[PDB]
Coordinates of C-alpha atoms in Angstrom, one line a residue:
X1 CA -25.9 -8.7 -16.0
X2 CA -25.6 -7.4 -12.1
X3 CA -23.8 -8.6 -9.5
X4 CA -26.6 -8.9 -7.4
X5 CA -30.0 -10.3 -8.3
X6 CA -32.2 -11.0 -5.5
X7 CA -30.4 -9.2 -3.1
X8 CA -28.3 -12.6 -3.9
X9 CA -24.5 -12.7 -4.4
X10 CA -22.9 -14.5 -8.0
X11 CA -21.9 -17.1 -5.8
X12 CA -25.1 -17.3 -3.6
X13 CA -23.8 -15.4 -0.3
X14 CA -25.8 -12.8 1.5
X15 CA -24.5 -9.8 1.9
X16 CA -22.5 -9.9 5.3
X17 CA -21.7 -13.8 4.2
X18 CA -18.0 -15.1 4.6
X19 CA -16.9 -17.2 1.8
X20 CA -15.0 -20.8 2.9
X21 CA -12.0 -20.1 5.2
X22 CA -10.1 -23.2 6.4
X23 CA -6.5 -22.8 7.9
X24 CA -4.6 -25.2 8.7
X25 CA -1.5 -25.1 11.1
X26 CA 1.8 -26.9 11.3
X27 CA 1.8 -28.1 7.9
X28 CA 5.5 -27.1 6.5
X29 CA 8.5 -29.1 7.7
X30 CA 11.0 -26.8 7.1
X31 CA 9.4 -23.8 8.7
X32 CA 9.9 -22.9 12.1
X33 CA 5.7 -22.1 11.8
X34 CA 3.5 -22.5 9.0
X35 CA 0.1 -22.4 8.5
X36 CA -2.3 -22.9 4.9
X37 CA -5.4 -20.9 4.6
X38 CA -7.8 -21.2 1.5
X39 CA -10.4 -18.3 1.9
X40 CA -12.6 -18.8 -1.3
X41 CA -10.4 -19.3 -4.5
X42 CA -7.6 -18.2 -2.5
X43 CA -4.6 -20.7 -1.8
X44 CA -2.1 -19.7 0.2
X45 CA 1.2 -20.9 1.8
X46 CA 2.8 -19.2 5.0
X47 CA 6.4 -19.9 6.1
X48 CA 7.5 -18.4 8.9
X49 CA 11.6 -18.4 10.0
X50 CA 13.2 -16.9 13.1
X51 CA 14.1 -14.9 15.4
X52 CA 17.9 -15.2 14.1
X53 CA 20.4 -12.8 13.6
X54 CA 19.5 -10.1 10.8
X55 CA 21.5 -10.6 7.6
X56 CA 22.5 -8.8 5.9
X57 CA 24.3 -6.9 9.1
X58 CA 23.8 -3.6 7.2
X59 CA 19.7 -3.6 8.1
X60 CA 20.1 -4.7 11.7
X61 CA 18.5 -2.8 14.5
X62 CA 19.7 -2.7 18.0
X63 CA 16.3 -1.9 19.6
X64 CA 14.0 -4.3 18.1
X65 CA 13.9 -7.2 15.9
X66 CA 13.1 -6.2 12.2
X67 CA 9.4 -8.1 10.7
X68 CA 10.4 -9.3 7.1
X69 CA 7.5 -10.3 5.1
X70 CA 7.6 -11.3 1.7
X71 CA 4.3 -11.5 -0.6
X72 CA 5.0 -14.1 -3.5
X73 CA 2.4 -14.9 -6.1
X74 CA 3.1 -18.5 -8.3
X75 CA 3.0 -17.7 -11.7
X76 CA -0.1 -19.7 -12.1
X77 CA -1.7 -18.2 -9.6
X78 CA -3.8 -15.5 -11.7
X79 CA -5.9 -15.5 -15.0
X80 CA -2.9 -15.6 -17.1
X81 CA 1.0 -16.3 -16.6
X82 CA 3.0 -13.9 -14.7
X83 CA 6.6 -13.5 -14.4
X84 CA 8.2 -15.1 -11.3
X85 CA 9.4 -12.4 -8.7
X86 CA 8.8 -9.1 -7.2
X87 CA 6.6 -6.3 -8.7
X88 CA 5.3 -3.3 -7.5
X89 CA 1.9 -4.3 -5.8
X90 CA 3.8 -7.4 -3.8
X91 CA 6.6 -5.3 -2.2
X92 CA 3.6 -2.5 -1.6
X93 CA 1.9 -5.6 -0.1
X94 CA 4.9 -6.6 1.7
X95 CA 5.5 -3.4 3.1
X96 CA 1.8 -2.6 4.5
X97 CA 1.4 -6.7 6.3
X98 CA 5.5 -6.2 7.3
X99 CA 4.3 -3.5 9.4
X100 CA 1.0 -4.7 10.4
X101 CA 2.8 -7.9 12.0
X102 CA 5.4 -5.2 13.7
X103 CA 2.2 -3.8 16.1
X104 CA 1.5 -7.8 17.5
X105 CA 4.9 -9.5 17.2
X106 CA 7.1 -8.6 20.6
X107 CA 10.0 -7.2 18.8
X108 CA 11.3 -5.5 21.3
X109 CA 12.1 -8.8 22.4
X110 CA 14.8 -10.0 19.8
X111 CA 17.1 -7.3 19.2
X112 CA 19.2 -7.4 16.1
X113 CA 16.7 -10.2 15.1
X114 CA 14.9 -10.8 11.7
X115 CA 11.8 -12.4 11.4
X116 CA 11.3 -14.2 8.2
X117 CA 7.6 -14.5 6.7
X118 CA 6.9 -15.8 3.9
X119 CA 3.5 -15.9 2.1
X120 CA 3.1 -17.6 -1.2
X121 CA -0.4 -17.0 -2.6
X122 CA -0.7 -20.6 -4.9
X123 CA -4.3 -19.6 -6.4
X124 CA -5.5 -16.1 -6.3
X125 CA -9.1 -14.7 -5.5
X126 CA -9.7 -11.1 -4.4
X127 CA -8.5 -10.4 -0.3
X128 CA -5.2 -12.1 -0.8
X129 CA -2.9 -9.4 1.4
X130 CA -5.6 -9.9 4.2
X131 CA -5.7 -13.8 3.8
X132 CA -2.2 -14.2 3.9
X133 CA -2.0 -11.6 7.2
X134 CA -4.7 -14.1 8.9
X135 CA -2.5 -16.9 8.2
X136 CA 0.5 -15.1 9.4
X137 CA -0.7 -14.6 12.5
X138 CA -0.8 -18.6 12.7
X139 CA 1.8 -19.1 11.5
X140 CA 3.7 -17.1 13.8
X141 CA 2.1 -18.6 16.9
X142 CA 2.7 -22.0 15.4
X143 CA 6.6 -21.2 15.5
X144 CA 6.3 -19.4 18.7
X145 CA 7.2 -16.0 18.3
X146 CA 5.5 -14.3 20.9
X147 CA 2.6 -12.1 20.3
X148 CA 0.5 -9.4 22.0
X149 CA -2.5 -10.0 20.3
X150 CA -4.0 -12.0 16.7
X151 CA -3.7 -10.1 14.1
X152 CA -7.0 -10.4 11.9
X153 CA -9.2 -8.7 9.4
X154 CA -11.4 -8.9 6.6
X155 CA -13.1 -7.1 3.1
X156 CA -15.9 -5.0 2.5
X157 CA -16.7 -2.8 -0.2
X158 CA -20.1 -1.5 -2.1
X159 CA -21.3 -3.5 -4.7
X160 CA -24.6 -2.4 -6.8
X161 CA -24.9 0.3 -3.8
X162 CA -25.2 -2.9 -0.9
X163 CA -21.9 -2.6 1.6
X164 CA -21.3 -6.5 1.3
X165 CA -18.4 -8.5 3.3
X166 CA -15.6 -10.4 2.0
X167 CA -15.5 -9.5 -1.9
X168 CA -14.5 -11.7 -4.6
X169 CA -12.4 -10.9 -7.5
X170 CA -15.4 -9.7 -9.3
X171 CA -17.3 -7.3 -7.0
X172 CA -13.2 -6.3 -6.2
X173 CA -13.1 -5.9 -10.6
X174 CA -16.4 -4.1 -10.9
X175 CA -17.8 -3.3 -7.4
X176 CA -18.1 0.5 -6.2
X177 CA -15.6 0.4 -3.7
X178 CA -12.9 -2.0 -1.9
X179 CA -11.6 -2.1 1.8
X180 CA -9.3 -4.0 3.1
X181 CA -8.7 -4.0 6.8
X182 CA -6.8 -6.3 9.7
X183 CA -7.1 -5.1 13.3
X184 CA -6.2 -6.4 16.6
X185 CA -8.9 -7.6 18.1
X186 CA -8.4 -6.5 22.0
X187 CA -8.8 -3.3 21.7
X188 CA -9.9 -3.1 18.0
X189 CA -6.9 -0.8 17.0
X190 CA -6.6 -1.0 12.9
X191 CA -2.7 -2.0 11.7
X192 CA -3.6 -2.7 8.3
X193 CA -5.8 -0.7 6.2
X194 CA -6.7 0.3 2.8
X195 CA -9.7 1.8 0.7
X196 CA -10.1 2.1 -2.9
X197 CA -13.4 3.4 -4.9
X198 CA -16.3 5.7 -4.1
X199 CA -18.3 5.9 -0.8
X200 CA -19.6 7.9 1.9
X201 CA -18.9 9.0 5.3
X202 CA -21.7 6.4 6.0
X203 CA -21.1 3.7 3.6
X204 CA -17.4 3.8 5.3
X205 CA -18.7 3.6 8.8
X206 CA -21.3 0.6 8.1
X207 CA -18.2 -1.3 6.1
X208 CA -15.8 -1.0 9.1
X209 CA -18.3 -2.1 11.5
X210 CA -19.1 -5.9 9.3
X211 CA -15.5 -6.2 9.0
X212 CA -15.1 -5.8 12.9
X213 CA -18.1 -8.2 13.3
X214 CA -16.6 -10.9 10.9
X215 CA -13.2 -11.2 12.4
X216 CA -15.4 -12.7 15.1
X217 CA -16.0 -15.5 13.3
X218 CA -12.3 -15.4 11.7
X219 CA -10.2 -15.2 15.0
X220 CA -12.1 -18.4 16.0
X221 CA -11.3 -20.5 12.9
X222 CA -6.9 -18.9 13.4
X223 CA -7.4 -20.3 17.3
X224 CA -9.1 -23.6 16.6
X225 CA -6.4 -24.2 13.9
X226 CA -3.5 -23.9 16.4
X227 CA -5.8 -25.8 18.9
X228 CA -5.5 -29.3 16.7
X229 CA -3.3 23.7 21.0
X230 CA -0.8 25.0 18.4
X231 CA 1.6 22.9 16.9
X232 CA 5.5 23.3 16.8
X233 CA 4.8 25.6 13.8
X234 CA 2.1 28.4 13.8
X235 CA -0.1 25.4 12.6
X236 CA -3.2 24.5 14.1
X237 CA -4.6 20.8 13.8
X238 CA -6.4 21.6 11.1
X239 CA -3.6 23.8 9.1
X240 CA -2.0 22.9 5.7
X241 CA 1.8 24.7 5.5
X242 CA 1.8 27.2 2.6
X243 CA 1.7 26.2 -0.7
X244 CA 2.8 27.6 -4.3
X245 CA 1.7 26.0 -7.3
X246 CA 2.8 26.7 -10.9
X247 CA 1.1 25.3 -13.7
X248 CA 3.7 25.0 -17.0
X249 CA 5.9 24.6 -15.2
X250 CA 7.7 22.1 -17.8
X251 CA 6.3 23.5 -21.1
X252 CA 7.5 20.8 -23.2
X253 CA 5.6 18.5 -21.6
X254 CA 1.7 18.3 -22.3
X255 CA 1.1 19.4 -18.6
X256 CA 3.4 19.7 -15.7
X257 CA 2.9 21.4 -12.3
X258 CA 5.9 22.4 -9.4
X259 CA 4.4 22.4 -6.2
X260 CA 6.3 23.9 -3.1
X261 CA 4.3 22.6 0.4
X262 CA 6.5 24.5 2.8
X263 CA 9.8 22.7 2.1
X264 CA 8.6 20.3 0.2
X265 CA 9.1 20.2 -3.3
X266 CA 7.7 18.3 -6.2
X267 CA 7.4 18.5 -9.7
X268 CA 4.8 16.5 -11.6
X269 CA 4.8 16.2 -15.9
X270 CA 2.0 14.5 -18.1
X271 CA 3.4 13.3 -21.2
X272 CA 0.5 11.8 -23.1
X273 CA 0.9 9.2 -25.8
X274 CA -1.1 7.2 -28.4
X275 CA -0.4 3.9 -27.2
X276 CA -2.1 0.4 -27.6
X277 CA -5.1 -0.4 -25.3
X278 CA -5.6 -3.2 -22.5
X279 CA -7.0 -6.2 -24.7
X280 CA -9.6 -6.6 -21.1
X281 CA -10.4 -2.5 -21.6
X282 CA -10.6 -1.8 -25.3
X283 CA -12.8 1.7 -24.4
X284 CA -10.6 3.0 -22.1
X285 CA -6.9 5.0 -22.1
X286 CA -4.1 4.2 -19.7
X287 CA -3.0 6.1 -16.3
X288 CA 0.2 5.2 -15.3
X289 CA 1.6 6.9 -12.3
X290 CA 5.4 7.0 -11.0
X291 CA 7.1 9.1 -7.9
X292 CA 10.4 9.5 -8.2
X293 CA 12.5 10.5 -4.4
X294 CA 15.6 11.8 -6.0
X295 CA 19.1 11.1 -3.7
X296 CA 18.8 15.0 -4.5
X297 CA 15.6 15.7 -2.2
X298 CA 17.2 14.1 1.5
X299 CA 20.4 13.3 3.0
X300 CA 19.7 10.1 3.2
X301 CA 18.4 9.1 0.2
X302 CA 20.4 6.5 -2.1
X303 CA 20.8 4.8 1.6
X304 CA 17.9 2.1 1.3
X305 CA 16.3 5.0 -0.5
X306 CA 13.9 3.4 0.6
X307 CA 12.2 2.0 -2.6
X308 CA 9.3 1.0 -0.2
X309 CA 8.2 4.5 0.5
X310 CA 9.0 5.7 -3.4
X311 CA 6.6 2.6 -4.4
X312 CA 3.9 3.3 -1.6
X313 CA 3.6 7.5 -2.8
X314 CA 3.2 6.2 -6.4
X315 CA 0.1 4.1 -5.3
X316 CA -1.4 5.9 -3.0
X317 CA -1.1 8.9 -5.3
X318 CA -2.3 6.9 -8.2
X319 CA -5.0 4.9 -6.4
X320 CA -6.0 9.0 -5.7
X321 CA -6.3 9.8 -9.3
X322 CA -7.7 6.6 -10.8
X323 CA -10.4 6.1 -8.3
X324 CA -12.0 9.9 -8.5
X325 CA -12.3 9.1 -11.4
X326 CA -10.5 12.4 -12.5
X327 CA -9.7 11.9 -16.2
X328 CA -12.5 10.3 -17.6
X329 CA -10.8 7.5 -19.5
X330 CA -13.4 6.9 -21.7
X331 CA -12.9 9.4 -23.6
X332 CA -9.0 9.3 -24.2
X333 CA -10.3 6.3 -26.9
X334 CA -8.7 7.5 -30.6
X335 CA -9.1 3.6 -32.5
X336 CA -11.6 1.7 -30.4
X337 CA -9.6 -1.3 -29.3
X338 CA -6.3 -0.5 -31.0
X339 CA -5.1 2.8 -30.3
X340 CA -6.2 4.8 -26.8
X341 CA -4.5 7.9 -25.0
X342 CA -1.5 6.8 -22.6
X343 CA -1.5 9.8 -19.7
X344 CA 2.3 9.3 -18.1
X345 CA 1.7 10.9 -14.7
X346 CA 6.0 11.3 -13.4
X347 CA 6.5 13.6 -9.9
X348 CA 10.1 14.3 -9.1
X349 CA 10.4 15.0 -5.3
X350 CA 13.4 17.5 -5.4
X351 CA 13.0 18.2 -1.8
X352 CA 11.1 16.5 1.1
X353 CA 10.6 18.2 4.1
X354 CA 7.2 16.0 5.0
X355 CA 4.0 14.7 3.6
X356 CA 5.3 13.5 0.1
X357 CA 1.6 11.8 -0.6
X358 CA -0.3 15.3 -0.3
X359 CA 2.3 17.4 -1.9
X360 CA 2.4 14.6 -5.0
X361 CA -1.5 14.9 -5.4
X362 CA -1.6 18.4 -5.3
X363 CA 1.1 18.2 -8.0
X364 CA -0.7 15.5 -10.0
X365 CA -4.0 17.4 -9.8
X366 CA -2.6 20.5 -11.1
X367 CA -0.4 19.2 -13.7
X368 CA -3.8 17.0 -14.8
X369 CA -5.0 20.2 -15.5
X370 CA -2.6 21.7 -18.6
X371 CA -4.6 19.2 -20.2
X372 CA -3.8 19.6 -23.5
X373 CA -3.5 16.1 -24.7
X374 CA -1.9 16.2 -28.6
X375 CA -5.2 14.9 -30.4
X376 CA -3.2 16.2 -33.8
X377 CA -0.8 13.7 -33.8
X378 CA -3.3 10.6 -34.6
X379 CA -5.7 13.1 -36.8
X380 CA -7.3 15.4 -34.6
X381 CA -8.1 18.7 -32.7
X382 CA -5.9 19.0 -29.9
X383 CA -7.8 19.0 -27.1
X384 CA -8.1 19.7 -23.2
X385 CA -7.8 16.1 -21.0
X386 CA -11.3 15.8 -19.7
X387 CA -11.1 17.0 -15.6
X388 CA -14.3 15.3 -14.1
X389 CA -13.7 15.9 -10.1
X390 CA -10.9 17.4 -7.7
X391 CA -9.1 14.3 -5.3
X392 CA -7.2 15.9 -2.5
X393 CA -5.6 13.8 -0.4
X394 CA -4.6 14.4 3.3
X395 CA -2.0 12.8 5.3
X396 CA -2.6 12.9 9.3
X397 CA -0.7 11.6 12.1
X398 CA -1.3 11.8 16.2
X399 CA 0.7 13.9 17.9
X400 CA 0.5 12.7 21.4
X401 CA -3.6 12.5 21.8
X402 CA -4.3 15.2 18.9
X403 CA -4.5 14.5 15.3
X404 CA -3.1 17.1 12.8
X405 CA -2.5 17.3 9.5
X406 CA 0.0 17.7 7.0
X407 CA 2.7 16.3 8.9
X408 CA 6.1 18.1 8.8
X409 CA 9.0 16.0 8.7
X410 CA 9.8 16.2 12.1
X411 CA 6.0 15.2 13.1
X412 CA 6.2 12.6 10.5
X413 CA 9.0 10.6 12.2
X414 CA 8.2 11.5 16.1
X415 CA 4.7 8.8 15.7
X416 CA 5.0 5.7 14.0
X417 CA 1.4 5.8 12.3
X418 CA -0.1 7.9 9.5
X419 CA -3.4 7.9 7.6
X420 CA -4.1 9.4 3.9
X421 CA -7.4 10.0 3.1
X422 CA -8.6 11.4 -0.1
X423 CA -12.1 12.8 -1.0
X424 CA -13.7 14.7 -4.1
X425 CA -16.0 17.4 -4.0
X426 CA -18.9 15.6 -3.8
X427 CA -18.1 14.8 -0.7
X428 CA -17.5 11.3 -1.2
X429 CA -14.3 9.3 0.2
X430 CA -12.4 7.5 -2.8
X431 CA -9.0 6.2 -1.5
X432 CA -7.2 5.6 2.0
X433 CA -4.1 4.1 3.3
X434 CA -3.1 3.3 6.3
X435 CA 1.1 3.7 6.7
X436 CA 4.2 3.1 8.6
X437 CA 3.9 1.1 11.6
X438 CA 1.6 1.4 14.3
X439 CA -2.1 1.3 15.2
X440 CA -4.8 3.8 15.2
X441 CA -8.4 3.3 17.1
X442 CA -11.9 3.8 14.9
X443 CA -12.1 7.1 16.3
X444 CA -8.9 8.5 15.1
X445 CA -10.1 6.1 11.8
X446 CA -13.3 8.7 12.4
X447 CA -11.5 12.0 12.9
X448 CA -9.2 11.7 10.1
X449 CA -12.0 11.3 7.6
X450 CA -13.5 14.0 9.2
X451 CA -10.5 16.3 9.4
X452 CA -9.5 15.2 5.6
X453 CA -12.8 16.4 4.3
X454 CA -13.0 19.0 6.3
X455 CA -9.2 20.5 5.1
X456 CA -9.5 19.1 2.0
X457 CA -12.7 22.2 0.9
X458 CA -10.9 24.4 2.1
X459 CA -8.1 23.3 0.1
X460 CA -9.9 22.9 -3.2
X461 CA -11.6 26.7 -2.8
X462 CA -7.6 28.2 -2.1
X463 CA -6.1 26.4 -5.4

């Protein structure tokens, strides 16, 4: 019925309560390092190769040695069958450990190196990206790459309105709110982190510090494993560049928005369609997101372009969406449990000048609302897509010891390190994302959820 019953977890656990961890070091032939971790249902194999030369020759970096992790799930390694290789969530989850490990490796060490890690979840429960990091970190040391500090972390969320630690698939499936987050431990800065749900200012603070408080616990079992004031701009900290939104924008579509953010420019369309249902949701239509960063919108692009990044915007901007719980799904139902509404949310970044996951939100809000979903195609009234709350997301980097906001492009690449968080109008915070590589303390942590509620009223009244 709930998830918890006598303030007593469907497993048993209290509510700061690790599940299992064992790790286990050395056990790979093959691998220069390896370690196996099993953290409740999860079973998961780390390889680690290198340092040796970076192939192909076209990524290599002079400066530094290049951190590739891989994220691999089995195909029997969830409810049912999946297809071998690659999909969107494991090269996200790639990307976001690759450049947590880049902070506590010694790159700088190993120029024109590669680093080879490789992390094949066997059996998945929920926390698999921050199991396999923990093991990482083991299996790094037990290959000998050299290392500044351990990289560790751990889950919280809010389940039946309790913060509780370490989540398993089903408070992940049905909880409030999910939070994954790996730090390193000497000075506490946080290289990985993510947030998906609905919480407050509070709710966030108290999750942070149990997950701080657990990698106690965590860091021991990794060791005793190895053991056996104005800105450039006019800006101000605080400033968003100007904006110009235009609703229509694509009238052929059944909403649409272009969105210019100084020199940024996006696009975003809604095409909605009658489509078949999930056969787990029945009562509920689809959201499916997609960023597009057209070879047209930098020089660069179609070098790399980088995928990676296009990927990560889609996510963060969906996560955005989805988790505000903006459209309502619920009511996008047209045969209950064969037919439901499928909302295609497509931005096309035709120029990027900076802060593609705030510009693409701001897009995808607005184009959200030319509703107008065809109801008169499968009977019907047409009708205006139900708008239930406002996410705006903010996107914040430190410029030396200040943060700001809104990042140009040229204050998006002078710090490694950026932070997206989004909030409604209620006040309440309902995704983050921690990016690119580098760490930021709990009080920059602190000031951008501040800063990114603060901005994002202001924003909400303008538009």
């Amino acid at each position: 019925k709930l998830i918890n019953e006598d303030n007593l977890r469907l497993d048993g656990r209290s509510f700061n309560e690790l599940r299992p961890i064992k790790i286990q070091a050395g056990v790979l032939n093959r691998a220069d390092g390896s370690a196996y971790i099993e953290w409740g249902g999860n079973k998961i194999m780390v390889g680690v190769y290198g340092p040796k030369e970076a192939y192909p020759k076209h990524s290599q970096d002079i400066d530094h040695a290049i951190v590739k992790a891989r994220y691999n799930m089995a195909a029997f390694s969830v409810d049912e069958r999946k297809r071998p290789g690659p999909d969107r969530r494991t090269m996200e989850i790639s990307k976001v450990i690759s450049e947590a490990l880049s902070s506590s490796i010694m790159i700088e060490q190993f120029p024109r190196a590669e680093i080879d890690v490789y992390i094949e979840v066997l059996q998945a429960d929920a926390g698999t990206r921050i199991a396999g990091l923990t093991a990482a970190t083991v299996a790094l040391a037990d290959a000998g790459v050299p290392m500044r500090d351990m990289v560790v972390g751990c889950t919280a969320g809010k389940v039946d309105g309790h913060m509780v630690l370490d989540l398993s698939k089903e408070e992940d499936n049905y909880g409030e709110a999910d939070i994954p987050i790996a730090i390193m431990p000497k000075t506490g800065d946080i290289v990985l982190m993510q947030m998906d749900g609905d919480v407050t200012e509070d709710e966030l603070y108290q999750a942070m510090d149990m997950i701080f408080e657990a990698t106690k616990r965590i860091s021991q079992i990794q060791r005793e494993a190895l053991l056996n004031g104005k800105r450039i701009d006019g800006r101000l900290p605080d400033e968003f560049r100007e904006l110009t939104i235009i609703e229509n924008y694509i009238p052929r579509a059944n909403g649409s928005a272009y969105v210019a953010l100084g020199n940024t420019r996006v696009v975003a369309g809604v095409k909605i369609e009658a489509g078949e249902p999930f056969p787990d949701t029945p009562d509920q239509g689809v959201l499916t997101t997609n960023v597009e960063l057209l070879p047209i919108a930098f020089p660069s692009f179609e070098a790399g372009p980088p995928n990676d990044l296009a990927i990560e915007v889609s996510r963060v901007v969906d996560r955005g969406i989805r988790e505000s719980k903006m459209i309502s799904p619920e009511k996008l139902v047209i045969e209950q449990g064969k037919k439901v509404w499928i909302v295609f949310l497509d931005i096309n970044v035709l120029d990027y000048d900076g802060n593609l996951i705030d510009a693409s939100t701001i897009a995808a809000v607005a184009a959200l609302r030319n509703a107008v979903v065809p109801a008169s195609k499968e009977g019907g009234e047409d009708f205006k897509l139900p708008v239930s709350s406002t996410p705006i997301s903010v996107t914040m980097v430190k410029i030396g010891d200040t943060l700001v906001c809104d990042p140009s492009l040229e204050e998006d690449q002078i710090c490694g390190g950026r932070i997206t968080v989004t909030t409604t109008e209620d006040g309440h915070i309902r995704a983050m994302q921690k990016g690119e590589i580098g760490a930021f303390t709990v009080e920059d942590v602190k000031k951008a959820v501040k800063m990114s509620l603060e901005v994002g009223k202001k924003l909400r009244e303008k538009y």
